[PDB]
Structure formats: C-alpha cells, structure tokens
C-alpha cells in the first residue's frame, strides 16, 4: 500500500483542495465531494487519483457541476467497507448535472450498506450494472428519478465480451462504460476474486488479486491488513484497529496522548481492540489503557476546565457525570430538569461558582455533591463563590448532607435572602473555620430578608379525625405585641419522612392565614383531608421588622402527623361469569380509596327468584320469541396603626343471614354448588378491619346466572296416550322436573302415514289443566307423537314416536 492513511475529509467550493489526495492510497474515513459550482468539464479531464484503492466509511457525491464521468477520478476504487454509513448508505450520488456514466469499473464489493442514486437527469449506464454481484443487500437500494426511467438514452454494451446475466427475467449484458465490462467471478470465487483467466485467489484476498492463492498479493484484505499481508486475525502483540487493520500498542497510546491535549475519541484498549471508548461496566487505568471492570457503574469522568451553565442544553452534556475534571460556574438566569441533568456529581476537580442566578431558591439539586479539591482556585483564591443570588435561601440540609472542601476560601456577598446561619454552618461542615480572612463574607448584605430567628414554636395539642385535624401550639409574643400580624400555617402530604421547604419560586405548601389570638392558645382546625395519609405541618410567624430589619420572628420545627383510617371505598368492577353449570367465577378491582390497610373482602350471594309472570304468560300464541339470558401593603397598614397609637400615647401623657365468604389476600373467588341456569345476586364489600366491628363499604350489586344443563330440557319418560271411540287421543308426558330454569311450553309434531308433519302448541296452563294434550277428531291411519320441551335455554329433545293405529 504505497500511500498514507488519509483520515476522512471533504472538499468544497473548488478543486484546489482536491489536490490533497495526490499522495493517498487508502481513506480511513469518509470522502465527500460536494458543493462545486464554478467548474467546467475542462477542469476534470486531466485529474486522476490511481493510487486510491479503498474507502472505509462511505463516499458521498452531491452537486458537482462539470463532472461527466468518474472513470477518470477513481480508476482503482475497489472496496467500500462501510464502517460508518451515511444514513445507512455506503455510496450516495445526489443531484449531479453533466454526469453521464458511473465509470467505477473496478468497484467489486461493498461490505455493508446500500447505494442511493437519485436526481441525475443526465446519468446513463444503470441497466448494465449487477448490484447483486457487488452489494450484499440489494433490497434497500433507492435508484430512481434518473434518465433511464424517463428517456431511452443509449446504453452501449461492448458485446463484441461483456458477461450477461439475469436480473429479473431476462439476460442483459453487464458493463460499466462503453469500453469496460462488469467482471463476474466464477461462483467458486465467491469473495476471493478472480484473475484474468478467472481463478480463485487467496482466502484473504478481496475483490482483485495480482497472483491467485497468495496472501501477499491481495489488492484488498477481506479481514485485516498487516505489512502487505492479509490475515484473518491480528496476532499478538497487535490489536485490531478500525475493524480493518492491525496495530501495536505504541501507535494506539500515541493517539490517546494526542487526544489528551487537543480539542477526539480518547482511545482505549479492550479485548485487543482500540475501540473509541470503554464499553459499559469498564474503566481505563493510568498505567495501562485496559478497560478493566471498574464496576457496572463507573467513575463517569467528564472533561471540559472552565464552563458556564445558563440553560438546560448547556447542562445536557453533564447528564450522568459523576466526576467533573474541571470547574463549574453556574449562572442560571431563569428546577426538575436541573435535578435530572445534574445531581449525580460527587466530585469537582476545581472550583464551584454561583453568580446572579435568579431562579434558584436552593442548591438541593446537588444531591450527590460530597467533596471538592479546589486545586484550581477562582480569583481571590476562592473555592466556593456566591454573588448576587436573589432568591437563594438554603444551600443544603446539613443535618445529613456531607460536603468537604480540600482547600479554598469562602465568598458570600450580596445575597438578600440567605440566612447567615447557613454561612456559619459552611465552615463547621467543610472544616473551614479559619481558612478565610476578613471581608470574605459580607455581614450586612446576606440575610436581609430572612426572619431566621425562629423562636422555637412548640405544638401543644394535636387531635386527629378521619377528615379533620385540629392543631394547638404555644402562643408567641414579640417584645412589642402589636407587631405580630399573625401566623401562617403550612401543610402538605409527605409520604416520605424527609421533607423540608424545598421548592422553586412553584411550591404546593398549602398555606392558610391565621389571625393573632385575642388577648388561650391560637390553634387552628383543618378541613378536607384524605383519610390514612401522612401530613407535614409547620408554623411560621409574620412580624413587622424594626428600622434595622430586626424581625425576631418565630418558627416551628416541621412535624409529621398521620390521620387515622375509616371505612374503605366500594370495590371496583365486580364481574360474575358462569364458567360452568354450577361454578361462578367472581373478579373485582381494588377500591379507589383504601382508607387504611385492607384486611379482607366481604362477599354475599343470594338465589334470584325467576319472574312469576312467566309462570302465567301464554307463549303458544303469537310472540314466540324467547329472550335468552401585597404583603408590604398590609405591613404598612399595621405600622400606620401602631404609629398613630404611639403618637397618641406620647402626646397625652406628660412626665412631670346469607351464604358469605371472606376473601383474604385475593381478588377473585369461585362459587360452587349452584343450580344450572339459576340467577344470583352478588353483594361485594371491602373491609379494612376484621375483629373490632368491621369497617366495610356499602353493598355492590351484580347479577349472575349459572350455565344451564345441556341435558335438563330433554324429556324423559314413556309417553302414554288414550284412544276414544270417536278417534280422540289424550296425550300425557313426563316433563324434565329439573329443567333449565323453566319450560314455557311444549311443541308437538304429529304425522300420520301418507301426510306431512303437523304442529301443535301446549301452553303451561293447557299442560296443567289437560295433563298434556287432548286432540280430537283423528283421521284413520297410523300417527306419531314427538314432544320437545322448550325452556329458556332453548329447544330440548323430542320424545319417542308413539305409533297408534286408528
């Protein structure tokens, strides 16, 4: 391979950059020739690159004016390995004017991908190309909108020579240009390639070979290339690189180092391959680039070492990062997305800075932050920097959150609503009690709007009900009792036991205002709760600060209260289906409101009495069809009243039973021992209490009918008849005493010999009064009797034919 390795490149706007391919033999990437307008056919007839042999990724051609044929551009292109495919395509030729023929007569095999050729109004010589002899998947090609299917441009096959095969149903010669044929190797040479006489080459030769059966003469390597020899696998100490060649450790390490100090694909070694990155569960070492399994999860180090954060997109690359090998200066000029992208950071190699971030109430999103080296210090030798943070209130829950800074001073200035107590906790938690100097932390600007005096308000009485809860706490009084405008009561459901005020500016924190007590503990009663739900409640005081913003307010620690339970809700969707003649399967859904821990379910079933009107209605007549079953304003008002009071005081004074089942740990039930085709009413309840006076819901009703017996409407019993002197017959039959629900009537079909089958209906009342049927005036001959019991299930079985000679 005389030539360089030539990492992939693109050429635009002129042919001046085209000369960069002069000393090239192989492209270890993708070659793009696109966007060429100021060119003429005179600019391409004297330009060729015979040294080019094979391309690894793909070849894109798009809008190159003046190009007429590629037969001179790439006379020796042979292989498109297609390691990376441009939109699952390995060869795209799009929108070429002046282009008339492909001309790539040496193109033999494409490892993977497909070929797309489109919008080439002047392109010919496409019918003489056998893509099945080159590509390995010809069903994904998209070759449309060319000149072949719109016109009949000449397609000269140099027959006299070019091999002719079948594409769909006809033999057509295969050729590339008017002077070149599409060579077809013998079927034995599937991929080795064939020489002039058509003889198979070495097992590793691909496409073409100078000498058959010789790995040292392959033009292209089928598996791997090494020192002018094609080998099936890389022997040690060579690792497979780019899926087409073999290389030692020195070059791969050099590439890694070159990537270390540049803008890249930091290369690592894994399973004897220099893959771009270690796969999941692995991590490189300093001594060797081995992708040793650090662990399923890995130290996810992300490289940058300064970067500002202003939006979600700027924080997108930080998602999943654990170690930042740099510094963070977050300036969000705007919550959940912040906790999504960030919050997995454990360690920062440099310094962290927060600046003028408007929409950050707290830094709780930095959940996993534990340590910062601070090797790189912000100007002023500061590791943690805070400035002009408007709405920032709390940094972290220092009761549980651990944060340690290896070195660096603290900067806290111009934070209107950051209580100085948190700044004091900074040094006791991070161990920076004496690491700072004077003026490092502003004493007069931080916490100018924070009543974090929190005179501990202690609750004194809590009463809980299924829907209402009453609170009572010890009353508070500032030194001037007129300043207490009133209390504010906060409450919000807390299924977890770790809830503090942490929300944006936004929060649910259902708040109700309470007037000050009339001078009895203040207290308050709550409404509209959810039974069996944990609640978090705390109380804060609203007071009017003095001239120097001395609030001296009072706060209550967050307490958790859990309201008691009640009777649960109705079970949902009770379905009762007859899966057998005596079996009923019952299924339901859990209640919407459990209102406590459900203990069991209460089920009742009662036999349904059939309609009595059916026992008295006649269906022998017509109608035989059978249905089958703000604040500042109020503060100024209060201060105005207090001021008038004070002025008056200054002026005036002068100092001289049903079958039931208890379903436990289940949602379905089966009922047995029920008569066939019997209706049933099912009562279903849910209970969260069993021994002490069960708390159960209201009854749930669903009607079910068992399957009828298949042998219950069949008439059993010998039919006995009586003959009168005037040929009158009395017919009686024994009904199936246990029928499918009930039998509406009986159908009788009698046929005398020589006549047709008649019909007759016996109603229930008729059957009762006549004990069957009474036919009078019978013609002489021999008759037959067949009676079928028609129940709600349908027609049954006929009786034995009662032959009698009259």
């Amino acid at each position: 391979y005389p030539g360089e390795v030539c990492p992939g490149m693109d050429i635009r706007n002129n042919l001046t950059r085209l000369h960069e391919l002069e000393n090239c033999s192989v492209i270890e990437g993708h070659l793009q020739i696109l966007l060429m307008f100021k060119t003429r056919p005179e600019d391409f007839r004297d330009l060729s690159f015979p040294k080019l042999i094979m391309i690894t990724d793909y070849l894109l051609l798009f809008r190159v004016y003046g190009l007429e044929s590629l037969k001179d551009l790439f006379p020796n292109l042979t292989v498109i390995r297609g390691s990376r495919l441009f939109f699952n395509y390995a060869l795209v030729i799009f929108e070429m004017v002046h282009l008339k023929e492909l001309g790539l007569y040496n193109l033999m095999n494409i490892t993977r991908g497909s070929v797309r050729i489109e919008k080439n109004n002047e392109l010919c010589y496409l019918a003489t190309i056998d893509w099945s002899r080159i590509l390995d998947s010809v069903e994904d090609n998209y070759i449309v909108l060319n000149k072949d299917d719109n016109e009949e441009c000449g397609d000269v096959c140099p027959g006299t020579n070019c091999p002719a095969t079948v594409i769909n149903g006809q033999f057509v010669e295969r050729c590339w240009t008017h002077s070149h044929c599409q060579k077809v190797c013998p079927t034995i040479c599937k991929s080795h390639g064939c020489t002039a006489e058509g003889l198979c080459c070495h097992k590793e030769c691909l496409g073409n070979c100078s000498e058959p059966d010789d790995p040292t003469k392959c033009v292209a390597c089928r598996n791997f290339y090494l020192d002018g020899q094609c080998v099936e696998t890389c022997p040690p100490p060579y690792y497979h690189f780019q899926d087409w060649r073999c290389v030692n450790f020195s070059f791969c390490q050099d590439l890694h180092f070159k990537c270390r100090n540049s803008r890249c694909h930091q290369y690592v070694i894994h399973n004897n391959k220099c893959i771009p990155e270690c796969p999941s569960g692995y991590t490189m070492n300093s001594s060797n680039l081995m992708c040793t399994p650090c662990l399923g999860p890995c130290p996810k180090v992300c490289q940058i070492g300064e970067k500002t954060i202003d939006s979600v997109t700027s924080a997108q690359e930080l998602r999943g990062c654990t170690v930042i090998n740099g510094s963070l200066i977050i300036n969000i000029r705007g919550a959940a997305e912040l906790e999504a992208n960030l919050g997995l950071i454990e360690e920062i190699s440099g310094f962290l800075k927060i600046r003028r971030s408007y929409a950050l109430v707290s830094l709780s999103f930095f959940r996993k932050l534990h340590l910062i080296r601070g090797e790189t210090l912000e100007i002023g030798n500061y590791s943690f920097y805070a400035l002009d943070n408007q709405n920032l209130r709390q940094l972290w829950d220092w009761s549980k959150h651990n944060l340690t800074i290896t070195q660096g001073k603290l900067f806290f200035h111009y934070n209107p609503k950051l209580c100085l107590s948190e700044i004091h906790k900074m040094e006791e938690v991070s161990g920076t009690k004496g690491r700072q100097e004077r003026n490092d932390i502003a004493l007069k600007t931080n916490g100018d709007q924070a009543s974090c005096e929190n005179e501990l308000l202690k609750f004194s009485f809590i009463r809980t009900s299924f829907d209402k809860i009453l609170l009572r706490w010890e009353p508070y009084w500032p030194p001037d009792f007129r300043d207490l405008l009133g209390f504010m009561l906060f409450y919000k459901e807390a299924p977890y036991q770790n809830v503090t005020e942490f929300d944006g500016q936004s929060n649910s924190w259902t708040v109700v205002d309470i007037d000050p007590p009339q001078r009895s503990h203040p207290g308050w009663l709550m409404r509209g709760l959810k039974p069996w739900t944990q609640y978090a409640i705390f109380v804060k005081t609203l007071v009017t600060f003095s001239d120097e913003r001395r609030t001296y307010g009072a706060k209550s620690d967050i307490i958790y209260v859990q309201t008691d339970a009640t009777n649960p809700s109705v079970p949902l969707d009770p379905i009762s289906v007859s899966n057998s003649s005596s079996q009923i399967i019952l299924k339901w859904k859990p209640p919407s409101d459990p209102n406590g821990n459900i203990t069991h379910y209460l089920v009742y079933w009662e036999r349904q009495a059939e309609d009595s009107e059916l026992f008295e209605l006649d269906y022998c007549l017509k109608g035989l069809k059978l249905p089958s079953r703000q604040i500042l304003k109020e503060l100024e008002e209060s201060s105005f009243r207090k001021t008038f009071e004070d002025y008056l005081h200054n002026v005036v004074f002068v100092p001289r039973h049903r079958p039931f089942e208890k379903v436990v740990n289940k949602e379905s039930l089966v009922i047995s021992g029920l008569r066939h085709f019997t209706g049933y009413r099912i009562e279903l309840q849910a209970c969260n209490q069993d021994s002490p006076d069960e708390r159960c819901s209201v009854a749930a009703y669903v009607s079910a009918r068992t399957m009828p017996e298949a042998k219950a409407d069949d008439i059993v019993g010998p039919v006995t008849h009586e003959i009168f002197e005037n040929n009158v017959v009395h017919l009686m039959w024994q009904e199936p005493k246990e029928p499918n629900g009930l039998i509406v009537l009986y159908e009788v079909s009698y046929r005398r010999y020589g006549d047709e089958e008649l019909h007759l209906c016996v109603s229930r009342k008729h059957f009762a009064l006549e004990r069957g049927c009474r036919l009078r005036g019978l013609s002489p001959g021999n008759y037959s009797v067949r009676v079928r019991a028609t129940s709600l299930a349908g027609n049954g079985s006929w009786t034995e034919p009662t032959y009698f000679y009259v």
Binding site: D480, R482, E645, H649, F653, V654
Partner: peptide, 27 residues
C-alpha cells in the same frame, strides 16, 4: 414586675399604677 409595656397594655398598667389621684397634665 417589669415588662415591655406599650399599646392598650400600657394604658391598663398605668391605670393600675394611678387613677385614685389622676393622671398629670400641664396646667
């Protein structure tokens, strides 16, 4: 006893202190 007296509380305290003889005023 000693406490911050102001508001109606001050009036009540001062009336407990005096009121059998009356509040002082400039003649």
């Amino acid at each position: 006893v000693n406490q911050h007296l102001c508001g109606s509380h001050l009036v009540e305290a001062l009336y407990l202190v005096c009121g059998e003889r009356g509040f002082f005023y400039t003649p």
